[PDB]
Amino acid sequence: YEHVTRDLNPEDFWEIIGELGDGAFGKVYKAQNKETSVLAAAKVIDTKSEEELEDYMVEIDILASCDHPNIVKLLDAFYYENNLWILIEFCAGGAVDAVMLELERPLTESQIQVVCKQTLDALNYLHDNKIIHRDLKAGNILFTLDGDIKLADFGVSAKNTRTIQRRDSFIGTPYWMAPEVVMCETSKDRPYDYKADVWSLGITLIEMAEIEPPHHELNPMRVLLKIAKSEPPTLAQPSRWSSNFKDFLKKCLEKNVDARWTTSQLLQHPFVTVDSNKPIRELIAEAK
Amino acid sequence: YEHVTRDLNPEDFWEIIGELGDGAFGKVYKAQNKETSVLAAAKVIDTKSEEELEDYMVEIDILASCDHPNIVKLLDAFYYENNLWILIEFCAGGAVDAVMLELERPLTESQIQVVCKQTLDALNYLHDNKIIHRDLKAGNILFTLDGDIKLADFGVSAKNTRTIQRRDSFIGTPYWMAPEVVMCETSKDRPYDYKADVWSLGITLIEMAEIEPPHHELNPMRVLLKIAKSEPPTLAQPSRWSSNFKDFLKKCLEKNVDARWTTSQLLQHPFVTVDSNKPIRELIAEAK
Hints:
2 copies of one chain form a homodimer. The first copy, chain A, has helices at residues 57-65, 96-103, 109-128, 161-168, 179-182, 196-210, 223-229, 243-252, 263-266, 278-286; strands spanning 5-6, 14-19, 27-33, 39-46, 74-79, 83-89, 94-95, 131-132, 141-143, 149-151, 158-159. By secondary structure, chain A is of the alpha+beta class. Chain A folds into 2 domains: 1-90, Phosphorylase Kinase, domain 1, CATH 3.30.200.20; 91-288, Transferase(Phosphotransferase), domain 1 (Orthogonal Bundle), CATH 1.10.510. In chain A, strands 1-5-6-4-3-2 form a 6-stranded mixed β-sheet, covered by helices on one side. In chain A, strand 3 and strand 4 form a beta hairpin. In chain A, helix 3 packs antiparallel against helix 6 (196-210). Chain A is globular. Chains A and B meet through helix 5, helix 6 and helix 7 of A and helix 5, helix 6 and helix 7 of B. Chains A, B: It is found in: Cytoplasm. Chains A, B: Residues 14-272 form the Protein kinase domain. Chains A, B: The active site is at 135 (proton acceptor). Chains A, B: It comes from Homo sapiens (Human).
């Protein structure tokens, strides 16, 4: 494909220094460029066949095509001896949840603020560019040396740019076109589907506030049913948090998908109006 | 792919007897099976490259996978010397508009009734099976020898079955899932997009009533803007048509996509409750 390297052993470019995580597709490794010494996250995915490469080409296309300071960048990809190697830029600090475990406590509200503004910038770009992350959560928000954050894992992301350019395409006079099609109000242009991510951002905020996400204590089999049954979740010890925090959540954690705010609307909120990552530079310095 | 034949000359199977239409992708031919003598519509599409075959694999997949009496069936497909051959079952009568031109008049209301019930059965199957035709119109509704109708041209159709099975797929406990995702109320499950076809059915009905579709007289450049500006179109000489005809249209030709009826709802309408195609067997007998 456009971004995958047929015929070259990637351990002739990149040396494994250790293991990092263990995402259930395969193993993931601390990698280092043999020439430049740039560090990278190496996903080695086993693939039975070559028809299986199509399964991963959306993560690859998303990463290769994204250009934002708060979204991980694709460095390099290889198909060699029935593995796909994906080499993603290496965020030195660790995953936001991996830190809460190391420190045995949740983020403070100012640390939540920085992640939430930085993570929201990410999402807004994605949504302006017709990508839905679809697996947002603390563990796929990553921390740089500099105390910034980069959003990662696009394994189950959706990218509607090719099906919009497919749908839009027509020839001849279109007397039969619906008025909604005519006014570019198909579901691909409309925000409805993209708003899954906003709800998640909500849960990720509570996750970061309380270490673990709502319903963490239930039988896993009951979690889905609980999300249906129950009103949107809230902070457990509400008195700990500001009224901006609590208001922000109400705009993310809203079941009437229409009522729920877009990212564009959300950037205008008083909770996310911050411009200094000191809070983080501190958290990450204490985890070193 | 699953349904295309690499390496065999299709004129060793199928003989060209004449030309039929001339769809702006290529030429289309009266074909006849050299062995069985079954007639077929042969689409010969020129293709510069092989990456271009992916462009047509949705028409092919739609036809191969559909099994309904009122949707044309795929007989055979071939890639040979930079052409795709698509061989579709041959509806002997002609296209519904091609008949109105031959006879120089529109269909009567009873002839419109049969097409509308038959065509609606088609659509309902499609929508139950997550396909949107997206180019419904008189000219892609075809007539058999027996005075039935089969719906054709899936060139710009959409099939959401693979992206629903892609989206639905998840692993681990999903604490972060939106409630709409959880209740299977993504845009792929919801009827909104599929309802483009219902509006079109509306215009196809007026087309069949008046020979040519609303706004046929305007500069083609103004048609889209007119569809936006204007209330939904109506029958020109309303006194000609029954109140069922007129009511049916109001349920198809409705700009508030929500208000507009599904096919499922529409099958329950008194306009479509017919069970004899005599009206058609007559129309097609007069065009022979």
